[PDB]
Amino acid sequence: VDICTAKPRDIPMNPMCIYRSPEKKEQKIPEATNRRVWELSKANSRFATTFYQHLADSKNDNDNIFLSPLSISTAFAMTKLGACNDTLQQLMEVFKFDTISEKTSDQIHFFFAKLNCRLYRKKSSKLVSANRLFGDKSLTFNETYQDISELVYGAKLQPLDFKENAEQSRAAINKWVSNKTEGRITDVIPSEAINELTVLVLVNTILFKGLWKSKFSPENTRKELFYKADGESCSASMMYQEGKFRYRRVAEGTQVLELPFKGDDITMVLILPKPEKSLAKVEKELTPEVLQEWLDELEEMMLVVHMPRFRIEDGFSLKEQLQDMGLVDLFSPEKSKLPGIDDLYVSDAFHKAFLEVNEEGSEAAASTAVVIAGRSLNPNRVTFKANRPFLVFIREVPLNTIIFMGRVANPCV
Amino acid sequence: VDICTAKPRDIPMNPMCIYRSPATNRRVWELSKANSRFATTFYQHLADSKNDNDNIFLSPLSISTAFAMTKLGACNDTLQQLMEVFKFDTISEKTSDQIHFFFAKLNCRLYRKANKSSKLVSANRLFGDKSLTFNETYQDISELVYGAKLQPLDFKENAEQSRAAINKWVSNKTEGRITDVIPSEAINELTVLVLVNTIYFKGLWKSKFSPENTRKELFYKADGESCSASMMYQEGKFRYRRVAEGTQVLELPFKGDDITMVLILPKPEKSLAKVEKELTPEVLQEWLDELEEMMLVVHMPRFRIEDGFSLKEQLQDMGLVDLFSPEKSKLPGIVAEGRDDLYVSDAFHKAFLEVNEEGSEAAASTAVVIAGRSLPNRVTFKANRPFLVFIREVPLNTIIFMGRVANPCV
Ligand SMILES: *[C@H]1O[C@H](CO)[C@@H](O[C@@H]2O[C@H](CO)[C@@H](O)[C@H](O)[C@H]2NC(C)=O)[C@H](O)[C@H]1NC(C)=O
Ligand SMILES: *[C@@H]1O[C@H](CO)[C@@H](O)[C@H](O)[C@H]1NC(C)=O
Ligand SMILES: *[C@@H]1O[C@H](CO)[C@@H](O)[C@H](O)[C@H]1NC(C)=O
């Protein structure tokens, strides 16, 4: 009985410890696409967009960004497995799982079961989950929890010594993650983050590696000025190439470009607004249904792509924002209530996201040059030149899931 | 006896007229350079007459051959001009006849091999009138160095059943690819002889393409119209070299490594024009040396193009006049009695190329016509963003085929 065969009966949860979300007062549903995976992903996306807009304000327009809502959601989802009462009512409400009409907190875990099966299930374009919870090596760690936090989210409890080993912990951890993420994510937990008062700490991240299905050519990269959020400009390494790429021009000339990865199931979506418009307006106006709609109308088209190479690493302390967003009873010592594992609450949540884009894709560079003989394209054709701030997305199409999302507001070095 | 293994002193070849200019394998190599030089020169003269978006294809090897043959019965002045325009004079010895021997050695090292997957053959043939008497020295030697036999045909009354007669022989020696070397009305009652050459190629891609990864795609002609193509695609290690003003030189070897196709596309902005205008055997060689193996993506159209035309015009512009003159033409070694009103009415050429996922198939034929009609022929099939193509034999340094692919559209 594994993740890909689980039926609701294989994912039980303590009664008198359940939530019932309200009825939603239509359905782009494509071909053979499991509706439950579809519904869940819409909620993950609702959270992905919301969380992102709040994280945008708390940052400068010139700051880059990059996280993994899929990460954070599957994380706090794992934790939520043992939530209950007013604590749980908040995990649902805040991660929009409560927006999947009528669906009960116990079902949510069966959906993730379904999504997770299809998500991380293996040539190229590998996706890996690095989520795990950390609490003191003390009291009850209800086995039933783990037994499932193994089947569904694939990673057990894991108690540490927040006392005699409060330091070789914030290293036992950083060592774990940085191992799974094949060395990409290193300093998972910041400095002076773990001590004795540290009760529980949540750590989440993802590892995506893949090649552009239509690689750019090194021989074509050329330094170019990138106009930033302020007014200035700088030296960025602009990549160049042409070919069929799903595209679409939308509201007030904002460009939406899809570059796929080998496999086609994992793609990168760029959202570049016209020069006169600010990424700000776009970021704020970007709602789950607007974004969802935009992607729905992408048509294959021949065009000229100009996109800068860029690297982006980022660390987060989910706690403050999460709180500010409504999630609190989990971060409070007296208000907590996780009967799945007393006074046990979350001391902090840390996330690290990493993305480096070159002429080949995500994986290590190379020199693969491109030779296209016998091709003549229309002189009048679309042109997508990203020499100004744009959004980024790495989604899994068939599962309509936003894996990573970010903002490249300064690619230069 | 074997015309191949033979040595210089063994071959009896003792023509009618010898020309005097002002190490065998070292000479065969010098012939190839002579030929290669004729190929680029000739090619430019052929470009400098078409729209820079016009398709072009030919086998300069096929041409250099048919005329090497004609050179046999050639004499005084015409014998020299032939020695010049085909740069046979740039060969070691200052003795015409010597050439013919080296050319046969080359044809041995080319079409005569113990197999190699890459099929590469040649067939030659003379076609004389039913009522004439051909000089026996010519006929024996024509069939000695080129394996060119002399078959009869009624040119005096059945000029037409004759063309059809000849065209088919090529159609047979070129897998039905070249089926119309000689046009219509080009051979009449006064038609004396007709020298013909044919070369056929067909190799498999060493690194085959995938029919799966091929995609139909719109291609825009220079005009403004567009037609569907079919690009193939594959990633792999290849000899390549971004050079010049961003020109790309790519080599695509066939099963054997002895015969390779070299593509040459100029920077998207620029055009072939300045590339063609500078093409020479050394240039093309310079590039061939820089080619370092490299990991790279290859996008190539799965197409086929045919091309036909007359060698008269250009061959004249290049200095070959006498042979075409009903007066100055001197070909006394052909019609026994020593007849001397034999001149080349016209020379026709017809080539064929087809590139697909398995490999390519090239065929060409050249027909020299002595005293027939001297009629420009039919047109091509234009498009845009063109690129050069050469199918060459590397160990032998000879351009078998070459051209400018412009319109791949089917
Ligand atoms: C975590 O706590 C629960 C109690 O809520 C434990 O569940 C009990 O398990 C035993 C043995 O399977 C049963 O006899 C009880 O009936 C269960 N409780 C109820 C009311 O269902 C669970 O075993 C605990 N986990 C650990 C660490 O043992
Ligand atoms: C709700 O919380 C109370 C304590 O506040 C706890 O005893 C109970 O099990 C929880 N669930 C229900 C349905 O009462
Ligand atoms: C035939 O031509 C050869 C040289 O081409 C010459 O030796 C001979 O004199 C000629 N004899 C005839 C058949 O007229």
- One-letter amino acid at A369 equals A
CA–CA–CA angle B114, B118, B123 (5° rounding):
75
Distance CA B140, CA B333 (A): 12
To test the ligand 2 pocket, which listed residue (A17, A19, A85, A88) has its Cβ within 8 A of the most ligand atoms? A85
Superfamily for domain range B205-300+363-409: Alpha-1-antitrypsin, domain 1 (2.30.39.10)
Distance CA A153, CA A11 (A): 12
The enclosing H or E element of A205 equals: strand A200-209
Other residues' Cβ atoms within 10 Å of the Cβ of residue B310: 17
Structure tokens at B222: 């220079």
Nearest-CA residue for ligand 3 atom 14 is B336
Give contacts of B 171-230 with A, CB under 8 A.
Answer: 217-221, 226, 229
Distance CA B138, CA B336 (A): 9
Q: Are A166 and A195 in contact, with CB atoms under 8 Å apart?
A: yes
Question: Among positive and negative, which fits the CA dihedral A211, A215, A220, A224?
Answer: negative
B138 lines ligand 3 (CB under 6 A): yes
In angstroms, this model's resolution equals 2.8
Four-point Cα dihedral B140, B143, B146, B149, nearest 10: 150
Distance CA A289, CA A285 (A): 11
CATH 3.30.497.10-classified regions of chain A: 1-211+308-362
Distance CA B211, CA B232 (A): 7
Distance CA B58, CA B366 (A): 10
CATH 2.30.39.10-classified regions of chain A: 212-307+363-413
CATH 2.30.39.10-classified regions of chain B: 205-300+363-409
Question: Among positive and negative, which fits the CA dihedral B330, B333, B334, B337?
Answer: positive
Which of A216, A240, A376, A377 is the best substitution to test chain B (most B C-beta atoms within 10 A)?
Answer: A376
Q: Do B387 and A377 touch (CB under 8 A)?
A: no
Q: Are B18 and B97 in contact, with CB atoms under 8 Å apart?
A: yes
Question: Which chain A positions have a beta carbon within 8 Å of B217's beta carbon?
Answer: 244, 375
- Listed by the residue before each break, gaps in chain B with C–N over 2.5 Å are 22, 375
DSSP A23: P
Ligand nearest to the CA of A84: 2
Structure tokens at A24: 């939603």
Interior/surface letters B385-409, b for 16+ CB within 10 angstroms, e for the rest: bbbbbbbbbeeebbbbbbbbbbbbb
Q: Treating both helix axes as pointing N-terminal to C-terminal, what angle do B60-73 and B78-85 enclose, rounded to 10 degrees?
A: 160
| Of the candidates A272, A275, A161, A153, the residue with the CA atom closest to the CA atom of residue A204 | A153
Distance CA A160, CA B85 (A): 90
Four-point Cα dihedral B209, B211, B213, B218, nearest 10: 110
**Number of residues that make up chain B:** 410
Q: Are A224 and A238 in contact, with CB atoms under 8 Å apart?
A: yes
Distance CA B248, CA A372 (A): 10
* Alpha helices, H only, A223-341: 279-285, 288-296, 318-324
Distance, in angstroms, between A372 CA and closest chain B CA?
4
Q: Which option is the CATH number for B8-204+301-357: 3.40.190.10, 3.40.640.10, 3.30.450.40, 3.30.497.10?
A: 3.30.497.10
Which residue among A370, A376, A378 sits closest to B297, beta carbon to beta carbon? A370
Structure tokens at A167: 């330091």
- For A126, half-sphere exposure in the C-beta direction (CA atoms, 13 angstrom radius) is 10
- One-letter amino acid at B286 equals E
Q: Treating both helix axes as pointing N-terminal to C-terminal, what angle do A105-119 and A35-57 enclose, rounded to 10 degrees?
A: 90
Q: Do A374 and B384 touch (CB under 8 A)?
A: no
Interior/surface letters A91-116, b for 16+ CB within 10 angstroms, e for the rest: bbbbbbbbbbeebbbbbbbbbbbbbb
Task: Provide the CA B373 distance to its chain's centre, in angstroms.
Answer: 23
Question: Which chain B positions have a beta carbon within 8 Å of A366's beta carbon?
Answer: 295
Nearest-CA residue for ligand 1 atom 12 is A144
Lining ligand 1 with CB less than 6 A are A 140, 142-144
Phi and psi at residue B106, to the nearest 5°: -60, -45
User: Residue A74 to residues A47, A66, A69, A111, A288: CA-CA distances in angstroms?
Assistant: 12, 17, 8, 11, 19
Distance CA A287, CA A46 (A): 8
CA–CA–CA angle B400, B402, B403 (5° rounding):
160
CATH 3.30.497.10-classified regions of chain B: 8-204+301-357
Residue of chain B nearest A378, judged by CA positions: B220
Q: Which option is the CATH number for A212-307+363-413: 2.40.10.170, 2.30.39.10, 3.40.50.10490, 1.10.760.10?
A: 2.30.39.10
Question: Which chain B positions have a beta carbon within 8 Å of A219's beta carbon?
Answer: 242
Q: Do A373 and B299 touch (CB under 8 A)?
A: yes
DSSP A61-116: TTS-EEE-HHHHHHHHHHHHTT--HHHHHHHHHHTTGGGSTT-BHHHHHHHHHHHH
Q: Which option is the CATH number for A1-211+308-362: 2.70.98.10, 3.40.50.10440, 3.90.45.10, 3.30.497.10?
A: 3.30.497.10
| Of the candidates B122, B117, B63, the residue with the CA atom closest to the CA atom of residue B307 | B63
User: Residue A401 to residues A44, A97, A257: CA-CA distances in angstroms?
Assistant: 8, 14, 17
- One-letter-per-residue 3-state SS of chain B: CCCCCCCCCCCCCCCCCCCCCCCCHHHHHHHHHHHHHHHHHHHHHHHCCCCCCCCEEECHHHHHHHHHHHHHHCCCCHHHHHHHHCCCCCCCCCCCCHHHHHHHHHHHHHHCCCCCCCEEEEEEEEEEECCCCCCHHHHHHHHHHCCCEEEEECCCCCHHHHHHHHHHHHHHHCCCCCCCCCCCCCCCCCCCCEEEEEEEEEEEECCCCCCCCCECCEEECCCCCEEECCEEEEEEEEEECCECCCEEEEEEEECCCCEEEEEEECCCCCCCHHHHCCCCCCHHHHHHHHCEEEEEEEEEECEEEEEEEECHHHHHHCCCCHHHCCCCCCCCCCCCCCCCCCCEEEEEEEEEEEECCCEEEEEEEEEEEECCCCCCCCCCCCCCCCEEEEEEECCCCEEEEEEEECCCCC
Residues of B marked as binding for heparin? 29, 109, 125
User: Residue B273 to residues B200, B245, B247, B306: CA-CA distances in angstroms?
Assistant: 29, 13, 12, 22
Structure tokens at B270: 């620029």
Q: Do A375 and B387 touch (CB under 8 A)?
A: no
Q: Are A133 and A79 in contact, with CB atoms under 8 Å apart?
A: yes
Q: Do A368 and B297 touch (CB under 8 A)?
A: yes
